Amino acid sequence: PKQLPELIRMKRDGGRLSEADIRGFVAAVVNGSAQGAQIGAMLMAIRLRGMDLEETSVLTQALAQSGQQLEWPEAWRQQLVDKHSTGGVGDKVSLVLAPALAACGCKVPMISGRGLGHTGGTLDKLESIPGFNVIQSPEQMQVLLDQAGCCIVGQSEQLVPADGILYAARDVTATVDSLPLITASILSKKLVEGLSALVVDVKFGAVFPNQEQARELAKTLVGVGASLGLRVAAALTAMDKPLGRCVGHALEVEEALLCMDGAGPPDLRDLVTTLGGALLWLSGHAGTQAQGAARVAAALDDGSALGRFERMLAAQGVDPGLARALCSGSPAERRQLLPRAREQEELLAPADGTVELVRALPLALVLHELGALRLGVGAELLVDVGQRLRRGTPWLRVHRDGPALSGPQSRALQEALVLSDRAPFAAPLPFAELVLPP
Amino acid sequence: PKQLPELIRMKRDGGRLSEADIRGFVAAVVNGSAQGAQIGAMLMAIRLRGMDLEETSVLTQALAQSGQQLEWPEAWRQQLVDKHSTGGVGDKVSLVLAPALAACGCKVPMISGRGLGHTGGTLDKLESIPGFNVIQSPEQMQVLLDQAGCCIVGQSEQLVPADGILYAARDVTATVDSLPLITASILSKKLVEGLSALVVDVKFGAVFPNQEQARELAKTLVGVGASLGLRVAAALTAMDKPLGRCVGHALEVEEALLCMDGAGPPDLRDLVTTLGGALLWLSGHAGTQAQGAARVAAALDDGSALGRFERMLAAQGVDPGLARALCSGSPAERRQLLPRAREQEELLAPADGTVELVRALPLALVLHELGALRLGVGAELLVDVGQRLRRGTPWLRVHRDGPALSGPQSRALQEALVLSDRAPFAAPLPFAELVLPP
Ligand SMILES: N=C1CCCN1Cc1[nH]c(=O)[nH]c(=O)c1Cl
Ligand SMILES: N=C1CCCN1Cc1[nH]c(=O)[nH]c(=O)c1Cl
């Protein structure tokens, strides 16, 4: 066995770590021996010197094996699927898609995570629901799949514990945007789920603003996935604007419910059907993308996705009365049942103009500031792309716990808003492009 | 004010940190805000992406200013000197030189450190002496300079606290061998000493095995030093073998006393006179190197260096009776008054041969293992360079607290010993070469 400083050095000098090296490190992360500073140091060493595919693969196997591998009754094998995102602002697609897919006859044991970087995390969003518990054991997860068809749980002592520790550390040390670290973090989770098919939404324009990097991530997820016996596909989607109208935790549960009522914004609905469709096709439950997309759409419209979501909530510890009130309530009734912020503040158009877009990144940065978790904090987009607005009309409603937005943070959000002199137009739908295993 | 993850990113991408950036980080190290993982991450980011001289300079000013700047009566100005080493195995030159120089009329407030990398630290060595306390306040240090002419103290809440925290973190994260981190760690300490002259022993063959890197370090210490108003010079010395006959904590106090009795091995004595000589010349208390070297030699021979060392010990909390017994005792009496190891084990020559050298690095690695602090653990070289030894004759005596050396650690020490078929010869003296401010 080598000590940590020796193995850090091996990577710091451009060297390739063996399998016992990788496992030694990971196992030290798990037991407490790798002190915080050594974890920060190795993460930065990997971030800057990289890993090649053999190494990423082993990293993935090692995080996967720090906890239990999950097992299901043979009868579920071909129905087990999942959808993971590499992250986008306002992306609440997972909240909708896990129950929608359960209502199409899939079983979905989603292991997901918390806020990472400036993208928000599904786990933090679900936690805005009083009594929703993300820590769920393997036995308990089998009961969740029985009752609801799906669940959304975090990493823990028994599931990928090492990815939870490395994940929390990356968040604060600028080692989030590492291809091998992302690949091993996503794939490790999905490997322990014992899936027949996985689709991963890779966004750009997002953790890798550049189209070139996103493609490399996509083929790395897919290639590394395929070598570990996982049928993976990736979608590349340009998200320079937030998905839908909401960014937050409670606000995004609210809008995901709107989507599950068969309403909500068209871009959120479009990506839910596109991505679930793709997944149904890949898993062999739909013959084509359009057939798949329509199966998922029908679940959003007939109330059945919503019904699976209510089962999921109650099964993960939400009081049953409260789950019913949430799924059956009106938009207004849902806003009173879920965290609100202490106060709300609207921001006003500076001049006449046509909304070209709201920029995702300035918005996420400011809300991470105000979010620093507070589950009612967030923002609400009051205008659409293509809309012509006049001077003075509200365009953002920020839900905040602290004081009136400062001069700075106000200017910073105001830069998010991009107006042209272009004639009004209808808001186009988001971009998608699949990537398969070669 | 920027948050830590932002400033880590700036350096991770090859970017140059401003002065407010550097100070922000350092001040966060000091207050607890920079978590262990962020410190590990920035250290590795600096280690791999480097800093240029403006940045190193500011880093140095910032670590220096995390605590108090030390002040002395105007009358001492031109007598204040110090000697720092970038590290070598068995290098106990500082223990001898601080009191020897005090006995030549200098005042020496040495701020030194602990084990870093695989080189041992002066502070750890002095601590083998019962009741020797390295934490000493600025007011207390003025009393030490009055009574003894010298002291040896560590970093603390009031002196370069930030270098103490970064120093401990580098030790475990393979960010020791960073030019800018070494420069700022050494220079920061020496800046707060308010010196008229400083000499820094740069070893190679040591933190930078390669001659090329050592030279770059030397001109960086000297150049960065000179721009901050410090008269610095560096000596380059090839230390591929241990200095003298001892490696440890208690063993090196013992040999430094032997040197102060005017005995001891010729290489230790040579480097003490060479380096102190240089320092006296640079500070203007000697006209030439040889005059300086002879002034220091005379202090080793007339018992006066020893007398200053006893004042220093008692003044830093060693019981006065115990200080007298140590300085006045015989070698044997000193070995009973200081930590011994639980057991001793000799290692035997495998075959006939002439000692070409004992290799420093294998020895340091093995003793860091067995040292993992235990202040009686160490090794003793029983043979000299040039000596012809027969099969079976003892060449190393390892003082250890644990069990009989394992098969491995035994082989690893045995590789340290390098025998030739060369006819016997007299052991040459170590290599030295000065470097001045340009
Ligand atoms: N979709 C989201 C929400 C926050 C982070 N993220 C992508 C992701 N997920 C991981 O599990 N691991 C990662 O490294 C990354 Cl990156
Ligand atoms: N002479 C010794 C004993 C252990 C470390 N060292 C050199 C040194 N000293 C510092 O103060 N800071 C460093 O970075 C370095 Cl490197």
- What is the rounded CA–CA span in Å between residue B176 and residue B162? 15
Together in a domain, A81 and A93:
yes
Say if CB B353 and CB B314 are below 8 A apart.
no
Which protein residue has the closest C-alpha to ligand 1 atom 13? A182
Q: Which pair of structure tokens corresponds to residue A111?
A: 């292991």
B146 phi, psi to nearest 5 deg: -70, -45
What region does A244 belong to: left with phi over 0, alpha with psi -120 to 50, or beta? left
Nearest by Cα to A109 from A65, A163, A155, A61: A155
Say if CB A383 and CB A355 are below 8 A apart.
yes
Helix, strand, or coil (residue B341) = coil
Residues of chain A with a CB closer than 8 angstroms to some CB in chain B: 4-5, 8-9, 12, 35-45, 47-49, 169, 171-175
Q: What is the CATH number of the domain that holds B104?
A: 3.40.1030.10
Which protein residue has the closest C-alpha to ligand 2 atom 14? B182
- Classify the C-alpha dihedral A327-A329-A330-A336 as positive or negative: negative
Q: How many CB pairs under 8 A join A and B?
A: 90
Resolution (A): 2.1
Together in a domain, B158 and B41:
no
- What is the rounded CA–CA span in Å between residue A288 and residue B352? 82
Together in a domain, A281 and A234:
yes
Together in a domain, A214 and A187:
yes
Q: Is A178 known to be catalytic?
A: no
Q: Which pair of structure tokens corresponds to residue A105?
A: 């006859």
Which residues in chain A have Cβ-Cβ distances shorter than 8 Å to B47? 12
Together in a domain, A18 and A157:
no
Together in a domain, A312 and A422:
no
Give ligand 1 pocket residues (Cβ under 6 A).
A 85-87, 113, 116, 119, 121, 176, 182, 185-186, 189, 207
Active-site residue numbers of B?
Answer: 82-85, 122, 170, 185, 189-190
State how beta strands B394-400 and B343-348 pair. Answer: antiparallel
Instruction: State the total domains in chain A.
Output: 3
Together in a domain, B297 and B361:
no
Q: For residue B176, what is the DSSP state?
A: S
Residue B201: which residues within 8 A CB-CB, separation 6 or more?
B83, B84, B85, B86, B88, B91, B93, B234, B235, B237, B271, B275
Domain end position, chosen among B68, B94, B120: B68
Together in a domain, A134 and A2:
no
Together in a domain, A395 and A292:
no
- What is the rounded CA–CA span in Å between residue A358 and residue B181? 43
B109 phi, psi to nearest 5 deg: -90, 75
Domain end position, chosen among A68, A90, A115: A68
Together in a domain, A384 and A246:
no
What is the H or E stretch that residue B335 is in?
Answer: helix B331-337
CA distance to partner chain B, nearest, from residue A422 (Å): 36
Burial class (CB in 10 A: 0-12, 13-18, 19+), A125: buried
Say if CB A361 and CB A277 are below 8 A apart.
no
Integer-rounded Cα radius of gyration of chain A: 21
Largest CA distance in chain A: 68
B388-389 β-sheet, strand order: B388-389, B353-358, B417-420
- B253 C-alpha to ligand 2 centroid (Å): 18
- A182 C-alpha to ligand 1 centroid (Å): 7
Together in a domain, A213 and A98:
yes
Q: What is the CATH number of the domain that holds A8?
A: 1.20.970.10
Domain end position, chosen among A68, A90, A108: A68
Angle at A414 between CA A411 and CA A418, to 5 degrees: 145
Give the structural domain span for B342: 338-426
Among the residues of B158-288, which ranges form H helices? 161-172, 179-192, 211-227, 250-260, 266-283
Tell me which residue in B37, B171, B175 faces A39 most closely, judged by beta carbons: B37
State how beta strands A394-400 and A343-348 pair. Answer: antiparallel
State how beta strands B388-389 and B150-153 pair. Answer: unpaired
Together in a domain, B315 and B365:
no
Burial code of A361-399, b = ≥16 C-beta within 10 A, e = fewer?
A: bbbbbbbbbbbeebbbbbbbbebebbbebeeeeebbbbb
Tell me which residue in A8, A172, A173 faces B174 most closely, judged by beta carbons: A8
Nearest by Cα to B200 from B232, B171, B241, B244: B232
- What is the rounded CA–CA span in Å between residue B366 and residue B375? 15
Helix, strand, or coil (residue B110) = strand
Q: Is A393 known to be catalytic?
A: no
Task: Write down the experimental method used for this entry.
Answer: X-ray
